[PDB]
Amino acid sequence: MKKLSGGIRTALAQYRELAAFSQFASDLDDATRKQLDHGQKVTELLKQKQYAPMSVAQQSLVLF
Amino acid sequence: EAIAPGVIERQSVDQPVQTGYKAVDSMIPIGRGQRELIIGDRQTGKTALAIDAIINQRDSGIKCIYVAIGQKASTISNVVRKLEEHGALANTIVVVATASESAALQYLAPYAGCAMGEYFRDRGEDALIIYDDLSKQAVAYRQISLLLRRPPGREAFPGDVFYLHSRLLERAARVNAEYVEAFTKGEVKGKTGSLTALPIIETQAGDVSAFVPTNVISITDGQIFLETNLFNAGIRPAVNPGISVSRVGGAAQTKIMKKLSGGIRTALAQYRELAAFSQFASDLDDATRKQLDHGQKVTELLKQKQYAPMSVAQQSLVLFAAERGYLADVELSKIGSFEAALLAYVDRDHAPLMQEINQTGGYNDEIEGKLKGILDSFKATQ
Amino acid sequence: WAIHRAAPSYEELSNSQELLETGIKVIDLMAPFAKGGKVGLFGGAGVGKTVNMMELIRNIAIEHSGYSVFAGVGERTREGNDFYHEMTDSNVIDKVSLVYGQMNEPPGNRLRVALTGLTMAEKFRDEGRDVLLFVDNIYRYTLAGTEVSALLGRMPSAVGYQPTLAEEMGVLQERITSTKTGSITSVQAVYVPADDLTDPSPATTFAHLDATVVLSRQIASLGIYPAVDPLDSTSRQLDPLVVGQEHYDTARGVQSILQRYQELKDIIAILGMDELSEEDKLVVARARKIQRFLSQPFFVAEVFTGSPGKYVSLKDTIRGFKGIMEGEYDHLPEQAFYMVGSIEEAVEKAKKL
Amino acid sequence: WAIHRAAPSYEELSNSQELLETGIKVIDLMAPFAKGGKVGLFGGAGVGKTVNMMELIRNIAIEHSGYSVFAGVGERTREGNDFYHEMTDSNVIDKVSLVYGQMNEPPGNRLRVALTGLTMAEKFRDEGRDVLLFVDNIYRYTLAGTEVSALLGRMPSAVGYQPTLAEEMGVLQERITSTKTGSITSVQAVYVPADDLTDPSPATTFAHLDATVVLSRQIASLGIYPAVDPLDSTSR
Amino acid sequence: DLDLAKASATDQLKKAKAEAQVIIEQANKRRSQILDEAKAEAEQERTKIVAQ
Amino acid sequence: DLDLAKASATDQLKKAKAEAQVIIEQANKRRSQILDEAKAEAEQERTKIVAQ
Numbered sequence A: 001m002k003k004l005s006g007g008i009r010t011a012l013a014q015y016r017e018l019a020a021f022s023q024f025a026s027d028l029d030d031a032t033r034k035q036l037d038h039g040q041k042v043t044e045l046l047k048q049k050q051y052a053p054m055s056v057a058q059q060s061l062v063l064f
Numbered sequence B: 001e002a003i004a005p006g007v008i009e010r011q012s013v014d015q016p017v018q019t020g021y022k023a024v025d026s027m028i029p030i031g032r033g034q035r036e037l038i039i040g041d042r043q044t045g046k047t048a049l050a051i052d053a054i055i056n057q058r059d060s061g062i063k064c065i066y067v068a069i070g071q072k073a074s075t076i077s078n079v080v081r082k083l084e085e086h087g088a089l090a091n092t093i094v095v096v097a098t099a100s101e102s103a104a105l106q107y108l109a110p111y112a113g114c115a116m117g118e119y120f121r122d123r124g125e126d127a128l129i130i131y132d133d134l135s136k137q138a139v140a141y142r143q144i145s146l147l148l149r150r151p152p153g154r155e156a157f158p159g160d161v162f163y164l165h166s167r168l169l170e171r172a173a174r175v176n177a178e179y180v181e182a183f184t185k186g187e188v189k190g191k192t193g194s195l196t197a198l199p200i201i202e203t204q205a206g207d208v209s210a211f212v213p214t215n216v217i218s219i220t221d222g223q224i225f226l227e228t229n230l231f232n233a234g235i236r237p238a239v240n241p242g243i244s245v246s247r248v249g250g251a252a253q254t255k256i257m258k259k260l261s262g263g264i265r266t267a268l269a270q271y272r273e274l275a276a277f278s279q280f281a282s283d284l285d286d287a288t289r290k291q292l293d294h295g296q297k298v299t300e301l302l303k304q305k306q307y308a309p310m311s312v313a314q315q316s317l318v319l320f321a322a323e324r325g326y327l328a329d330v331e332l333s334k335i336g337s338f339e340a341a342l343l344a345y346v347d348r349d350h351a352p353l354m355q356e357i358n359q360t361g362g363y364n365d366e367i368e369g370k371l372k373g374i375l376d377s378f379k380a381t382q
Numbered sequence C: 001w002a003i004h005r006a007a008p009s010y011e012e013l014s015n016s017q018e019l020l021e022t023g024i025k026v027i028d029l030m031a032p033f034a035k036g037g038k039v040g041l042f043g044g045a046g047v048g049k050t051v052n053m054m055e056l057i058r059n060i061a062i063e064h065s066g067y068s069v070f071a072g073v074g075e076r077t078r079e080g081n082d083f084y085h086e087m088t089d090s091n092v093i094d095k096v097s098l099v100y101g102q103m104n105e106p107p108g109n110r111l112r113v114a115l116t117g118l119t120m121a122e123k124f125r126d127e128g129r130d131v132l133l134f135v136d137n138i139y140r141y142t143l144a145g146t147e148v149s150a151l152l153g154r155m156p157s158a159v160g161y162q163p164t165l166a167e168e169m170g171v172l173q174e175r176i177t178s179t180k181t182g183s184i185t186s187v188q189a190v191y192v193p194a195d196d197l198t199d200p201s202p203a204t205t206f207a208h209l210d211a212t213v214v215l216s217r218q219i220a221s222l223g224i225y226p227a228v229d230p231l232d233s234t235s236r237q238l239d240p241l242v243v244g245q246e247h248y249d250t251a252r253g254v255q256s257i258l259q260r261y262q263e264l265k266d267i268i269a270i271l272g273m274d275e276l277s278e279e280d281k282l283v284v285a286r287a288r289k290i291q292r293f294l295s296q297p298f299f300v301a302e303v304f305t306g307s308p309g310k311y312v313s314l315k316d317t318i319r320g321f322k323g324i325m326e327g328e329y330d331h332l333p334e335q336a337f338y339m340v341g342s343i344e345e346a347v348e349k350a351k352k353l
Numbered sequence D: 001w002a003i004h005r006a007a008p009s010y011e012e013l014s015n016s017q018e019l020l021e022t023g024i025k026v027i028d029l030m031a032p033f034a035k036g037g038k039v040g041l042f043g044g045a046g047v048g049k050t051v052n053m054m055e056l057i058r059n060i061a062i063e064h065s066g067y068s069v070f071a072g073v074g075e076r077t078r079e080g081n082d083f084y085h086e087m088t089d090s091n092v093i094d095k096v097s098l099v100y101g102q103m104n105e106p107p108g109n110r111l112r113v114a115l116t117g118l119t120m121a122e123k124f125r126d127e128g129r130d131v132l133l134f135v136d137n138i139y140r141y142t143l144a145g146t147e148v149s150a151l152l153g154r155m156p157s158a159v160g161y162q163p164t165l166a167e168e169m170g171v172l173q174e175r176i177t178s179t180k181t182g183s184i185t186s187v188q189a190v191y192v193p194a195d196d197l198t199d200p201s202p203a204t205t206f207a208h209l210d211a212t213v214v215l216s217r218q219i220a221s222l223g224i225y226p227a228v229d230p231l232d233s234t235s236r
Numbered sequence E, F: 001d002l003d004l005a006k007a008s009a010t011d012q013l014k015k016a017k018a019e020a021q022v023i024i025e026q027a028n029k030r031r032s033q034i035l036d037e038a039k040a041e042a043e044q045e046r047t048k049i050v051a052q
């Protein structure tokens, strides 16, 4: 988990730095558009239902 | 200091108290025994509306009372001089506690006025009382309270600043015939007394979500909110629909008015969101053209001069004209001319129907038919 | 019975998922409540938390067999009289018990009148029945404590409140609960001073309720009644395991849309609506349609608007909201949805504009 | 005379509502003065407040036959000295009575000095004249009241202001009215803390003002005098 | 249809002479009754002033 | 001639509405003059009866 989670901090950090453009996202360049649309997917990935806990293998697999 | 009549001594309010104004008599109806806040900013026509309510009872068997708390003495003398000018003074009690007088007199002024109003209530008569500024009473009480070292609360008002206005306005009531019999030792039979109140509150910068304005919105049976933007744009009385309400509603109107008005205030609340959203452009341009034609000619229609009250007959056909779609044929600048002409037309031609609607609540399918026959014979001859 | 009592033991409490239907679209889409649970109506002054309570009385307390209790704590006597006669002129009065401590009365009455209603309800509960308890404004029970507190020689606390606010409130709210022997279902109106939901008195109450329905002025002043805020109302019962996956999923989708619409209001206000992505304009249109459709005509509000009341069943409202969200009514105008019953009445009103 | 007095009783007030003709076109058109009214003067600095004050001090002495009183409540001493000189060399000094309790003075001085000027204007009124009373900053009268209230140990009110705020203001503003024998008009410089027209001190003063003339830096930069702004100036 | 043109040319000018007649007759009557209301009001505000 | 009749007819109604509103406006002007003069002159009666 220490190995794999290190990429999620950076994904979400770049996303937080680009999030201000989401409302003009149409005018953006495809270079940053890919970061902006990657952050949204790794954010949608961290959603989870109640009382449904994940063993470390499942979390590592999904974060991988 | 007294405790108001209990729950079993009251009666439901069922009789209209006509002010002169198209706006309030149709959107915010007031009934005998109701309590109805007038709230707004400063220099908005609060006192204008209140003494125009007094002046109109000049001829309907209601005794009126005007309590001025913390006002300038010259302004009070000017109000008394205007009441005398229009012949209303012979029918009013004026209790005054000017801005100079000790805070205890301002604090206790409105209870002294309710003590005089309750004389007519308990004898089976009707009265109307106007507390000129219940903001200045709250300020005087806050002073009396801080000088006695009591721990203040929100906005530095004491803990019981609700109870202050609560035990006051809860005395404006309608009492049933048995309470009048019991109180008066059987002298008066079969009559119900009442006491109507119109407290006036003042808000800083249009804030109706402050401490004291909201304490009082919570004690009365409605509020008339006068908005300074409407007032500066010339829309007077500046009744802001969608913040003003009447908690007894149609039950306090004549039958005719109760039918003609209907949802008009929620209609204008709709309209006033929609015209602020559609600040750029529109859709169903024809449909919203004939909507924000009437949803805007209503606002142009309800504006009225000062010291010009108009009887229920006159307000009723006007609301018919507006509500049934007859004003889709007229440009805004014409509305005032249109009404000025119509109210003379019906004083010439249909002279007796006015006398007939003034006495009765008067609604029939006969009346609606005749009230279309009134429109048509005029609409074709302006 | 003495009006001072201890709350039932933890061992005696009971838990009941039995959902309770009310013919109000927003309340039982967004914040459904259960038989034996607590409901609170939070709102400032004049936003509709008494009209809502009278409609709940109509929809539950006439269609319910057991007894019922009404405590009027520190409210208008006019409305107590109107209610007493509305009952008596429909013969349901003889199954309702009333207690009144209205706002005329000095602080002692408003302070203790809630415990009397609770004592009557607890007697009916212990007999083995199930009871309805409606409290007309529970905020006046603590304000009457703030009035008395300083004279009792107690140092003031956060905003001038008595130092014992949370205990005064808990020792009441704790005895109004269902138990193994019988159940109390309750509705409580909770005034919010200065419209400030973070004031200590509202803030300490949210923890004592299962369903919280938060009314707001910025919605009532649009003419949209009941002025419930769906981004702030909530219920313990809104679980997939309690209301089913489809009800739950519809409610969550509605919250999602209305929230996304809140996020756009600042850019809409600065730059106007034309800078929106071509699909954000669609979010805005569906959000406004949903805001309209949350409105309903009540039977007790005929006096205010003329229009006749409507009763909407749950099966009939989740269907309509699922429709609006899935886009199958995008061709109707907004006004087609304002103040109607089910979705069919909107599809009809559109014909007549 | 004793400086502490009761306001004119209800039956002494003048039974009419007249206007005061200042002779300045902007003022007389856009913001007329009621005889016996209060007038706010919201100009800043550099726009010529004091030359307007001198113009009124002159016109009300020459065109009508009144006098004037200038009460300096807690303002810079430098301004007072150079105003005393700007008047002495325009010959109006012979027609105005001056009383000064500037910032350097103890709180007790700055509190009452407003009443001294007022009780001199009341003497000129009893002589049947029409008077004009200038208060160089009413906000500093309020603040001197707050300081003295804190000294006495009374509990703080709404935004820290004394509990007696509205009474302390009304007992001053209520003594200056028209009367069956004379009248006192007043022109009062006002200052709004934090530019907040909702603060209790502005909010309390505005309840008493009748007119309100706003001076503008811009209208002066155009070289147009007096620098009154017609769109923000108002009179009821 | 030469004389259909003549017919319309007669008719519409007749109609102008009629409508621009009644418009002015009607406005003259409006002016008459407005100057009637003027007296009905002025002589009634006098009663107010003498009662005062 | 059909066409120019069409035009010169509506000419008269365009004129007629203007000459209607002009006389209505004059009626209202005379109204306000009547009212203001009757008010100003009744005030003399009030003041003289009072001073007497």
Ligand SMILES: Nc1ncnc2c1ncn2[C@@H]1O[C@H](COP(=O)(O)OP(=O)(O)OP(=O)(O)O)[C@@H](O)[C@H]1O
Residues within 6 Å of the ligand: B041, B042, B043, B044, B045, B046, B047, B048, B049, B202, B236, B237, B304, B305, B306, D236
């Ligand atoms: N219907 C109206 N049409 C035109 N003008 C009006 C109307 N009602 C009031 N006004 C004007 O508004 C001005 C202020 O009104 P009014 O004094 O009644 O407000 P107010 O709330 O009493 O002010 P304050 O709160 O300072 O006493 C008055 O000069 C009056 O002429």
Ligand SMILES: Nc1ncnc2c1ncn2[C@@H]1O[C@H](COP(=O)(O)OP(=O)(O)O)[C@@H](O)[C@H]1O
Residues within 6 Å of the ligand: B218, B245, B246, B247, B248, C044, C045, C046, C047, C048, C049, C050, C051, C052, C225, C226, C296, C297, C298, C301, C304, C305
């Ligand atoms: N369904 C509704 N339709 C129309 N008006 C409503 C509706 N619900 C509430 N209102 C309005 O809400 C106003 C506030 O009344 P009320 O509910 O008594 O406030 P409070 O909750 O403070 O007692 C009423 O006067 C009424 O016009």
Ligand SMILES: Nc1ncnc2c1ncn2[C@@H]1O[C@H](COP(=O)(O)OP(=O)(O)O)[C@@H](O)[C@H]1O
Residues within 6 Å of the ligand: D044, D045, D046, D047, D048, D049, D050, D051, D225, D226
């Ligand atoms: N009426 C006027 N006519 C000519 N110049 C004027 C007039 N009013 C102001 N000014 C100019 O503006 C200056 C304002 O100075 P002053 O009266 O001291 O203003 P303040 O005291 O507010 O600083 C004058 O000295 C003059 O230069």
Ligand SMILES: [Mg+2]
Residues within 6 Å of the ligand: B046, B047
């Ligand atoms: Mg007023």
Ligand SMILES: [Mg+2]
Residues within 6 Å of the ligand: C049, C050, C075
């Ligand atoms: Mg209520």
